[PDB]
Structure 1
Amino acid sequence: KIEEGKLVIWINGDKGYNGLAEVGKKFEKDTGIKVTVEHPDKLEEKFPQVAATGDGPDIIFWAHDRFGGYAQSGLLAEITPDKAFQDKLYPFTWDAVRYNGKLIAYPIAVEALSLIYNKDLLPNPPKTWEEIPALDKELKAKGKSALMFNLQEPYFTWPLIAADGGYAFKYENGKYDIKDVGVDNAGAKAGLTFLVDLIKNKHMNADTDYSIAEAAFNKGETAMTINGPWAWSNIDTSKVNYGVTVLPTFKGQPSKPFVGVLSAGINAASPNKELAKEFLENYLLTDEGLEAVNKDKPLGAVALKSYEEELAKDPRIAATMENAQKGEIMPNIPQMSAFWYAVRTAVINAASGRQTVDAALAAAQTNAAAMATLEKLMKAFESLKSFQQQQQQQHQHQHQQQ
């Protein structure tokens, strides 16, 4: 149950909400309509609960991948920017906010992995994955290593696996074909074979996780790491002279990191859809609009062309957008759960030598089908639970009857 003649916005606490409120303050002075910017605890799980009944905020800010599930449940309204406003943002971002052909959210910020190198240890970072083994031997003489990054989570190893033509799901016609999985094709096989080759030649360690990767780079033990903008602040605190650049190529093809997009979606239950559109399109998604948010807490790379060109003077931001443009957009579909499950197991089992690359990737298809079944069962029994609570008490109850 939301209000009217006013706007209420939900954005996460680690974002520039104070700056966003100042955009809402600018909105009030022009239209006379009050904007409240709330940052409630765990709004990502709160929003599906409250919007189902017709409540919650007018606008919600979150990563696009979670919006797929909101649109599935009919919680988000179809946004209607004209052709001219769509040319204002980078074309690829709009694909991240599409569900069932319809547009469901406005892209705000773009997030992806880049290659972070130590400038003092390595002044000219490698442009290819293939020249890293040769670089490791040269650094091992100085008591250092070439590259250390998280190998436990498929999110970090995917950029290399996807390089030569591996994909999560095929995206064409504006939809993801769930019968077209690209986990054990020729390109993903070569990608992961290179990773396993790096481990059995002792150029990397299969035990390396996020904490070990970060700690190593910030202490100056390793020349390179692979990480997102979320980690820049901690590297700043270590006093390490670092640079952020384009990811290394593999077989001449660029690394394809997953692209995450911070998006603004309109609650389908909102009586202020016309107002939200006016706010987002003409007050927020403008140079002056994003600037207020960015000065509170940096947005990183942004969807708006005109303002991205301005931030891109920071070479670390330019590198985020470059790797993003060369990358795969994170699929917003529910099948993505089964994907992480299968690929996490596949990478772990290949890297440990417990399974061949070929057999580990082949097992992913059967392992993801297994997860599907478990979720299918979860949904089935949750439904039966609700059904019983629906009929026993809602209708006939001991002390009334059907």
Structure 2
Amino acid sequence: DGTVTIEYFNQKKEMTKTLEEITRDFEKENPKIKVKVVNVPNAGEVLKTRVLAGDVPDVVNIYPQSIELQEWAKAGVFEDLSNKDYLKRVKNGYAEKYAVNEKVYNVPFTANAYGIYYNKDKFEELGLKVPETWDEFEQLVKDIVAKGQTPFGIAGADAWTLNGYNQLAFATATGGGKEANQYLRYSQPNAIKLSDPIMKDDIKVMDILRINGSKQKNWEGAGYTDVIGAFARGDVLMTPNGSWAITAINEQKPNFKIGTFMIPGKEKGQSLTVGAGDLAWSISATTKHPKEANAFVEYMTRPEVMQKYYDVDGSPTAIEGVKQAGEDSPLAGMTEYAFTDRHLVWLQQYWTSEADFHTLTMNYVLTGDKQGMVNDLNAFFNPMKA
């Protein structure tokens, strides 16, 4: 044949079209290299299945904060990338941030963030402003309801959409990422109580989604795609989601200017965001073609290649020589403190899982069971403390 075939296991399902075009550009420059792009649903679970099966894809899209990356790096599943030349194209010391045993096993090209998408046009129409406190965010929702408009679009069927919301609910209440994990993860068993002021603050922030008439009709069984469309059409004024959503929203061709804002704290200037490596690649240590796999990763570190991805995606990049958008862009408010302290890492960096945290978050929006949520939190965190 002559040509060799490497596999790229993608999790960026929103960026399927652009990543394939970049792949074709690579294939045209490398005639002896063919790249198969894999896009399967529930890619995170399929990856667990494949790694254990010993069928590790050549290039793997894996989130570098995950416990999966940490465990598999120590096991020797991934190639050491510490002394690669293309790693010098990663600024903000972002590759070093997710080092395992002081060794880099992942190239995080982009960083995701979390906030609230909002309709700038209808905000101007109704004379609404971006909230700076919990109380203001409560009022904003109530003001929208009274105007006969739906504030939030919530994906009840996809609990992972509110992961960033609840994590920031704890973050803004406690002080930051470390402070949130001190209350939740590194506390004593059965420490989380309803009487705890931090918990009372958490409920308050979560109750913003529980305000009368805050959510759209038939939200309980609404998916991630459903809410993207609902926001794009202008059926809902806001939707809480990650920076990964904007490319899907843009594709729906909305007839309004899109904006974002961070989930605020108790008082002004206490707003935070959460995220980690979005487009983040690792190379299999057991690959038959390590030179070809490295050439694919190196290709993505190129500024003119990364620009092509960024122009569609929009999430902040750590790649050198990429012209990024200004404060006029949709993700301006959400990614305002990108690559700073106020951009804390996903809390599941020090958890054994996160799936149940999604469930108990959404379950509260469904039921409003305060004690039930507290019980869910203890049942989730206790096994980790043991």
Same-fold status (TM-score > 0.5):
yes
Aligned runs of 1:220-299 on 2, under 5 Å? Answer: 220-228=234-242, 229-230=244-245, 232-234=247-249, 237=252, 239-251=254-266, 252=268, 253-270=270-287, 273=290, 276-277=293-294, 280-281=297-298, 283-293=299-309, 298-299=312-313
What is the aligned counterpart of 1:330 among 325, 346, 350?
Answer: 346
1:193 aligns with 2:204: yes
Indicate how the Cα distance of structure 1 residues 146 and 61 shifts in structure 2: closer, same or farther if over 3 A, else same. Answer: closer
Find the aligned partners of 2:74 and 2:324 in 1 and give their Cα distance: 36
Rg comparison, structure with higher value: 1
The answer as to 2:61 corresponding to 1:61 is: yes
Tell me which amino acid in the other structure corresponds to 2:73.
A
Query: Are 2:352 and 1:341 aligned?
Result: no
SS at structure 1 position matched to 2:240: strand
Q: Does residue 1:116 correspond to 2:130, yes or no?
A: no
Separation of aligned partners in 2, 1:5 and 1:178: 49
1:296-346 CA distance string (max 9 Å, x none) = xx3432533435433557712444533654333235658442x44156326
1:226 to partner: Cα distance: 1.8
Contact 1:162 1:191 (8 Å CA) reproduced: no
Contact kept, 8 Å, 1:76 with 1:104, in 2: the verdict is: yes
CA contact (8 A) 2:228 2:248 kept: no
Q: Distance in 1 between matches of 2:322 and 2:332?
A: 8
CA distance in 2, matches of 1:38, 1:301: 25
TM-score by length of 1: 0.68
Identity of aligned residues (%): 16
Seen in structure 2, the aligned counterparts of structure 1 residues 5 and 112 have a Cα distance that, compared at 3 Å, is: same
2:165 to 154, 157, 168: 157
The answer to whether the 8 Å contact 1:301/1:318 transfers is: no
Q: Is the 8 A contact 2:109 2:277 kept in 1?
A: no
Which amino acid counterpart does residue 92 of structure 2 have in structure 1?
Answer: Y
Q: 1:392 matched to which residue of 2?
A: none
CA distance in 1, matches of 2:287, 2:103: 18
Q: Report whether the alignment pairs 1:79 with 2:95.
A: no
Pairwise CA distance, 1:73: 4.4
Once the two structures are TM-superposed, the CA of residue 254 in structure 1 deviates from its matched residue by 1.3
Deviation at 1:287, TM superposition (A): 0.8
Pick from 22, 25, 48: which aligns with 1:19?
Answer: 22
SS at match of 1:22: helix
Using the TM superposition, give the Cα deviation of residue 8 of structure 1 relative to its aligned residue in structure 2, in angstroms.
Answer: 1.9
Q: 1:260 to 1:190 in 2, by over 3 A?
A: farther
Equivalent in 84, 89, 92 of residue 91 of structure 2: 89
Closer, same or farther in 2 for the Cα pair 1:310/1:350, shift >3 Å? closer
Q: Aligned partners of 1:77 and 1:132: how far apart in 2?
A: 46
Q: 1:160 to 1:149 in 2, by over 3 A?
A: farther
Contact 2:262 2:334 in 1 (8 A): no
User: How many Å separate the matches in 1 of 2:192 and 2:74?
Assistant: 25
Equivalent residue letter for 1:105: N
- Say if 2:33 and 2:292, in contact at 8 Å, map to a contact too: no
CA distance in 2, matches of 1:245, 1:265: 31
The answer on whether the counterparts of 2:116 and 2:334 sit within 8 Å (CA) in structure 1 is no
Q: Which structure 1 residue ranges, 5 or more long, are not aligned?
A: 374-402
**One-letter code of the match for 2:90?**
K
Mark the CA change 1:53 to 1:130 in structure 2 (over 3 Å): closer, same or farther. closer
Question: Does the C-alpha gap of structure 1 residues 194 and 335 become closer, same or farther in structure 2, counting only changes over 3 Å?
Answer: closer
Return 181-190 or 241-250, whichever deviates more. Answer: 181-190
Kept in 2: contact 1:127–1:249 (CA 8 A)? yes
How far has the Cα of 1:20 moved from its partner?
Answer: 2.5
Distance in 1 (alpha carbons) for counterparts of 2:199 and 2:376: 14
Instruction: Say yes or no: does 1:8 pair with 2:38.
Output: no
Report the 3-state secondary structure (helix = DSSP H, G, I; strand = E; otherwise coil) of the residue aligned with 1:191.
helix
Contact 2:303 2:319 survives alignment (8 Å): no
Q: Secondary structure at the match of 1:60?
A: strand
Does the 8 Å contact 2:229/2:252 carry over to 1? no
Aligned pair count reads 354
